[PDB]
Amino acid sequence: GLPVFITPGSGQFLTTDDFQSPCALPWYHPTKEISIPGEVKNLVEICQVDSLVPINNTDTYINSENMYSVVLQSSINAPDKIFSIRTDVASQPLATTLIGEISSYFTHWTGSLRFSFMFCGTANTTVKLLLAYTPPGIAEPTTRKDAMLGTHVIWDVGLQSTISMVVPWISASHYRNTSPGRSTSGYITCWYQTRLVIPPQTPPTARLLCFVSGCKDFCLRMARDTNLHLQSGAIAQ
Amino acid sequence: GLPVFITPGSGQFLTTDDFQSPCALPWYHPTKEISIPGEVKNLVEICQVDSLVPINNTDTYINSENMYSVVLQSSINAPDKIFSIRTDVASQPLATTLIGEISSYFTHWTGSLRFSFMFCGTANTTVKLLLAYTPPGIAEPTTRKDAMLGTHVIWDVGLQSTISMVVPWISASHYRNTSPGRSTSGYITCWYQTRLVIPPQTPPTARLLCFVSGCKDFCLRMARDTNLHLQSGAIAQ
Amino acid sequence: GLPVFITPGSGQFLTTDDFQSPCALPWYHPTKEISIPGEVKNLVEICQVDSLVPINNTDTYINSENMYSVVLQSSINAPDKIFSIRTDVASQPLATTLIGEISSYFTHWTGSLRFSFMFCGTANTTVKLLLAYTPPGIAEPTTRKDAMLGTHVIWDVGLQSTISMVVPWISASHYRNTSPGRSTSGYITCWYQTRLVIPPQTPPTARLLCFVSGCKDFCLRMARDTNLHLQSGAIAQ
Amino acid sequence: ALDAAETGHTSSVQPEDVIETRYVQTSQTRDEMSLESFLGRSGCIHESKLEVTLANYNKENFTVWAINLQEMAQIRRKFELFTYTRFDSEITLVPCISALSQDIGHITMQYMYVPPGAPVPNSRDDYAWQSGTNASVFWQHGQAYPRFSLPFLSVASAYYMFYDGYDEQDQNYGTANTNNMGSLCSRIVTEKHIHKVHIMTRIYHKAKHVKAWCPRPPRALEYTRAHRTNFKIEDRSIQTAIVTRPIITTA
Amino acid sequence: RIIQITRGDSTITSQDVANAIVAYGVWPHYLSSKDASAIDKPSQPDTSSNRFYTLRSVTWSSSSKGWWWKLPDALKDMGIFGENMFYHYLGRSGYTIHVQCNASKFHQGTLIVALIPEHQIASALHGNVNVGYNYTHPGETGREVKAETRLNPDLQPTEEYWLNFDGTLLGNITIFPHQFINLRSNNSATIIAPYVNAVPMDSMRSHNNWSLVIIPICPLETSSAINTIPITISISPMCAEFSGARAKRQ
């Protein structure tokens, strides 16, 4: 036979290998691909989907819809903070979003994130609000003016339902690690730019729902078996 | 399958082998090479760098800058020897130079060496000095006239700072072994060609610093895990 | 991978194999071949060299030059035999010649052999001599006339120093075995064709030296680790 | 022949200046001196020693090692020669079984590259031995040496050989910040069996398709602390590669 | 052997100097669209910060042992440069550096100046220790080298200058772009460098992407009563850029 000689890396199985292989079932033929709707080629189209943050991750809301929602108080003359979050894609709560899980299935990420926000309160009601981002190396802001020094948007709550805005990609490195240990990507932070004003005898309350998705900018590397989910023992049947 | 038959040298690992190998991480893609400054292709560009000899390798200077330096005595009417060294690239002290270490990482060497010398004394001061080389098979010289029979340079200490000169390659063989055991390459030797003259009430002293590098002529073979450095036990972390 | 299947003769080492093999020392480069004199391509050029037979292989001469030489007796009015030898290339003494050793390193031989002879006696002296060969299947001759029936030369000892002559290749087979066991190739035999005549008060003596080499006709096969030399135990160092 | 070394530029360059030379075909290749040579020879990197524990075979019989080039001196000193370097990696495994018992039988062994934020195996029975996308690879008694090609990994252009600061809240100064490659892992795949054995893997690598960035001076003294350039060892003194002599006028 | 220098608004000369080698020959430049990571159009203060600034006077003696700085931290207080650095998560800049060191015709001694990369300093103490931020980031105040009693020693860097503070031999330090102040050769010395990193731009306050070292290779002396001379260093940043604007960093 041809004189051949064998390199190391022979005779192993690697779960992430790439090769031809022989057939168990020669002469077989598969069923034809009918034109089923809902084609897909990549994970990024899933990233493009807006999904809700369970923003309001606490005991009093977790076992319910309400952890996707925040409640606003039209009673308050103040500039102050409504909420804040990290921005690291596999941090809590963001990891629990589908982009979060897809990022949690991965080790590297890059590109800017889309964020979106609906004024879910009574149609008769008005406000304008500050949604802001904090470039890190610094504490999460404690005045509205701090957030005004960050990159931010002021929401003209017009007839249109939703404000949508982007955390710009400002990683030193072209990628960042998907889960921080002792590390940070920056903060989302939210504030009363005006007070919220309902008209008289409206419910003394309002709701806000918050969305995120990958921008056209977004991408991942180092697919890894995700942090997000655990199996204990045998899966019964 | 094709009739094949297997030669010896199969199934070993050689730390110095050469082959293709299969990927652990298929479909991955590396980060782009940005145009970082400080490109390199070969070790010879490092050889081209002048580095100081720790010429003055003794107890009284070793734990300090001063082993890179020699002190001259303007008080002396004499022709006599200032210093001398071997020329074998991996001999002490030369081995400790970066060309020394690179040679110490290697078994064969060839080509002529550049040597350079600054009159580090007071700007007002004058001398001319003999830098000389001894072709071996012979003892290291004991008169200045001996060195004058060797290949040598007399330093016109003009406005210009430095004299630079070459030990010619005069190996019988096109290469020489990088470290001698019971063997020799020749000597550097240094002498008062004139007395050193300071003008009155100058410091009664002067300094000289000495440099070496590979010439355009220089090259190495048989890269080997260097003599120069030792690991004892485990490297802790 | 390609469907392959393995023939016997795999996985052995044969000291006389032929193959490519992988490098222990990739990227290395050898020293250039300078034009050293004394080129060689084959063993036959060594065969072409005349070397002396230690013709006179006995106790009284062995530990000396004299076993290369024979002594002639100008005192004798006789036709009779001066010496005789086998012709089998690896027989004693011929094996000890360099063609002998080269043949002893081999199992088959072919082609005619050159033989040569100098009248080493006093320049003033004259003779003519019979050098003869015996085609075998027969005893070594016991009269000069017997040798005269064999193929032979009568030496006109003119001004010129040497007679040179050939045992013709008369093997039944195109080759013969290099060493005979219970076998024979024929004889060299030497005789006084005239008496040897010195002029008066010359030394009562003469010398003859004898040479052999491969002719242009000569060749070998089945290189084998030679009979001629033995190692006992370990070779010390 | 005269210059100002103080310029920073290398000194008077030319050998023909001070020797009346004959023409010579100086014709010796620098190719062994290439980076794809000098980096591009393999060497050992780390030592995966394990004992097969019996009493909880299912728990203990695995190891994990933080990937670095910083704890075998020769390889370390190749890379401790630059600011940064980039390469693809031949990786080669030299698994060895040592018997503490009359036989070893058949044995099979797992390895996994654990990139950071993969769930680290806690147990020789951990579900983390499943590896749908992690590079995991197998060896067993009588099998040839495993190898794989690992491409250049970094989030940056090149690996930091050194770094001059911190992860942003200011600890782990230097490479312990930048060089989070995660870890290699190993684990016995054969189930519980009677043979007390040690498994040792020597792991090797060669950098090829190499590039390197701004050379820096070689390490002068014994290593000490992997990521950290520390060298002043405890109850010890700084005995460098330089050796002293009695007088500077004697060679 | 004369030069004049002009950056952003400010100018420098020596009339006894040999020109800088440009580090690796790469004259400083802005990032490229081909290589960049950051998405914004970044902050170009140009003339208002690619201009000179200079450090407090050090001074030296025959007894002196060495000095160094880490950049950009050594310039954190340089007005526009300093705040533009502190207000961004990232930036990049090269540097032009000149060291000012005149003596009389009647002095001897020499310093080596080395520009140096990440220069990852070793601890003073043995064992499980590493350098603390206060010392890696000395600011413009820098690190002179001294014989004694630096507190928090476990977090101090080593003082071992001839081991380059990292366990590498001095004298091979000429591997980097470097010059000598030699009092005969010159009265000043100069070096210029582009930006560099494994990354197209970097977290300025978190990582000293360049460093600068000056060492008394040969002892200062004169017979004159002026037994000591100051040294000072001036730097201009080059092509300086900043990205990810937010609050001032603490």
PDB file of C-alpha atoms in Angstrom, chain A residues 64-152:
ATOM      1  CA  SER A  64     -45.669  36.274  37.766  1.00  0.00           C
ATOM      2  CA  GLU A  65     -45.815  38.532  34.729  1.00  0.00           C
ATOM      3  CA  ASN A  66     -44.956  41.475  36.970  1.00  0.00           C
ATOM      4  CA  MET A  67     -41.196  40.904  36.939  1.00  0.00           C
ATOM      5  CA  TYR A  68     -41.332  41.983  33.245  1.00  0.00           C
ATOM      6  CA  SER A  69     -42.940  45.287  34.352  1.00  0.00           C
ATOM      7  CA  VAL A  70     -42.303  48.406  36.445  1.00  0.00           C
ATOM      8  CA  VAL A  71     -44.844  50.662  38.171  1.00  0.00           C
ATOM      9  CA  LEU A  72     -44.606  54.500  38.035  1.00  0.00           C
ATOM     10  CA  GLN A  73     -45.939  57.019  40.588  1.00  0.00           C
ATOM     11  CA  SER A  74     -47.646  60.114  39.117  1.00  0.00           C
ATOM     12  CA  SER A  75     -47.796  61.543  42.692  1.00  0.00           C
ATOM     13  CA  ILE A  76     -44.066  62.478  42.802  1.00  0.00           C
ATOM     14  CA  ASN A  77     -42.458  65.870  42.094  1.00  0.00           C
ATOM     15  CA  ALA A  78     -38.864  64.472  41.821  1.00  0.00           C
ATOM     16  CA  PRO A  79     -36.005  64.004  39.267  1.00  0.00           C
ATOM     17  CA  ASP A  80     -35.068  60.670  40.796  1.00  0.00           C
ATOM     18  CA  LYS A  81     -34.149  57.124  39.717  1.00  0.00           C
ATOM     19  CA  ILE A  82     -36.887  54.790  38.502  1.00  0.00           C
ATOM     20  CA  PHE A  83     -34.582  51.745  37.947  1.00  0.00           C
ATOM     21  CA  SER A  84     -31.111  50.585  36.857  1.00  0.00           C
ATOM     22  CA  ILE A  85     -29.488  47.379  35.436  1.00  0.00           C
ATOM     23  CA  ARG A  86     -26.074  46.084  34.284  1.00  0.00           C
ATOM     24  CA  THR A  87     -25.369  45.791  30.501  1.00  0.00           C
ATOM     25  CA  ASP A  88     -23.183  42.657  30.415  1.00  0.00           C
ATOM     26  CA  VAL A  89     -25.279  40.350  28.152  1.00  0.00           C
ATOM     27  CA  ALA A  90     -25.092  37.248  30.404  1.00  0.00           C
ATOM     28  CA  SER A  91     -25.601  39.168  33.700  1.00  0.00           C
ATOM     29  CA  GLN A  92     -28.857  38.922  35.677  1.00  0.00           C
ATOM     30  CA  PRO A  93     -31.582  39.623  34.715  1.00  0.00           C
ATOM     31  CA  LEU A  94     -30.537  40.159  31.020  1.00  0.00           C
ATOM     32  CA  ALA A  95     -29.205  36.570  30.702  1.00  0.00           C
ATOM     33  CA  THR A  96     -32.813  35.309  31.026  1.00  0.00           C
ATOM     34  CA  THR A  97     -33.764  37.150  27.808  1.00  0.00           C
ATOM     35  CA  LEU A  98     -33.405  35.042  24.693  1.00  0.00           C
ATOM     36  CA  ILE A  99     -30.430  37.180  23.565  1.00  0.00           C
ATOM     37  CA  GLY A 100     -29.200  36.617  27.110  1.00  0.00           C
ATOM     38  CA  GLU A 101     -29.471  32.826  26.734  1.00  0.00           C
ATOM     39  CA  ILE A 102     -27.905  32.856  23.277  1.00  0.00           C
ATOM     40  CA  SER A 103     -25.064  34.954  24.754  1.00  0.00           C
ATOM     41  CA  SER A 104     -24.932  32.536  27.697  1.00  0.00           C
ATOM     42  CA  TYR A 105     -24.372  29.766  25.119  1.00  0.00           C
ATOM     43  CA  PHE A 106     -21.299  31.799  24.028  1.00  0.00           C
ATOM     44  CA  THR A 107     -18.069  33.233  25.511  1.00  0.00           C
ATOM     45  CA  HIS A 108     -17.374  36.329  23.404  1.00  0.00           C
ATOM     46  CA  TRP A 109     -19.760  39.084  22.321  1.00  0.00           C
ATOM     47  CA  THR A 110     -19.537  42.294  20.348  1.00  0.00           C
ATOM     48  CA  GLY A 111     -21.623  45.128  18.985  1.00  0.00           C
ATOM     49  CA  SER A 112     -24.245  47.495  20.321  1.00  0.00           C
ATOM     50  CA  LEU A 113     -27.574  46.459  21.884  1.00  0.00           C
ATOM     51  CA  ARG A 114     -31.072  47.774  21.101  1.00  0.00           C
ATOM     52  CA  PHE A 115     -33.350  48.646  24.009  1.00  0.00           C
ATOM     53  CA  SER A 116     -37.027  49.606  23.822  1.00  0.00           C
ATOM     54  CA  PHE A 117     -39.673  50.946  26.169  1.00  0.00           C
ATOM     55  CA  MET A 118     -43.505  51.403  26.048  1.00  0.00           C
ATOM     56  CA  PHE A 119     -45.495  53.859  28.121  1.00  0.00           C
ATOM     57  CA  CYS A 120     -48.090  51.254  29.144  1.00  0.00           C
ATOM     58  CA  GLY A 121     -50.126  53.770  31.240  1.00  0.00           C
ATOM     59  CA  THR A 122     -53.494  55.389  30.547  1.00  0.00           C
ATOM     60  CA  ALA A 123     -53.794  56.855  27.053  1.00  0.00           C
ATOM     61  CA  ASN A 124     -54.893  60.253  28.473  1.00  0.00           C
ATOM     62  CA  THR A 125     -51.579  60.498  30.485  1.00  0.00           C
ATOM     63  CA  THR A 126     -48.297  62.344  29.710  1.00  0.00           C
ATOM     64  CA  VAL A 127     -44.633  62.350  30.808  1.00  0.00           C
ATOM     65  CA  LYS A 128     -41.138  62.607  29.383  1.00  0.00           C
ATOM     66  CA  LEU A 129     -38.498  60.226  30.778  1.00  0.00           C
ATOM     67  CA  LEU A 130     -34.737  59.770  30.791  1.00  0.00           C
ATOM     68  CA  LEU A 131     -33.261  56.493  29.617  1.00  0.00           C
ATOM     69  CA  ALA A 132     -29.488  56.526  29.984  1.00  0.00           C
ATOM     70  CA  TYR A 133     -26.358  54.399  29.739  1.00  0.00           C
ATOM     71  CA  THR A 134     -23.211  54.497  31.874  1.00  0.00           C
ATOM     72  CA  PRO A 135     -19.818  53.872  30.280  1.00  0.00           C
ATOM     73  CA  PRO A 136     -18.100  51.859  33.053  1.00  0.00           C
ATOM     74  CA  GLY A 137     -14.951  52.204  35.194  1.00  0.00           C
ATOM     75  CA  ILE A 138     -17.315  54.229  37.446  1.00  0.00           C
ATOM     76  CA  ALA A 139     -20.194  53.737  39.929  1.00  0.00           C
ATOM     77  CA  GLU A 140     -23.872  53.524  38.821  1.00  0.00           C
ATOM     78  CA  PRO A 141     -25.279  57.113  38.882  1.00  0.00           C
ATOM     79  CA  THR A 142     -27.055  58.664  41.911  1.00  0.00           C
ATOM     80  CA  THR A 143     -28.403  61.887  40.340  1.00  0.00           C
ATOM     81  CA  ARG A 144     -30.325  62.401  37.113  1.00  0.00           C
ATOM     82  CA  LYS A 145     -27.626  64.930  36.037  1.00  0.00           C
ATOM     83  CA  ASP A 146     -25.028  62.131  36.345  1.00  0.00           C
ATOM     84  CA  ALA A 147     -27.000  60.109  33.829  1.00  0.00           C
ATOM     85  CA  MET A 148     -27.357  63.285  31.672  1.00  0.00           C
ATOM     86  CA  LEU A 149     -23.514  63.261  31.411  1.00  0.00           C
ATOM     87  CA  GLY A 150     -23.761  59.644  30.148  1.00  0.00           C
ATOM     88  CA  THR A 151     -25.134  58.810  26.675  1.00  0.00           C
ATOM     89  CA  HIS A 152     -28.912  59.037  26.936  1.00  0.00           C
TER      90      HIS A 152
END
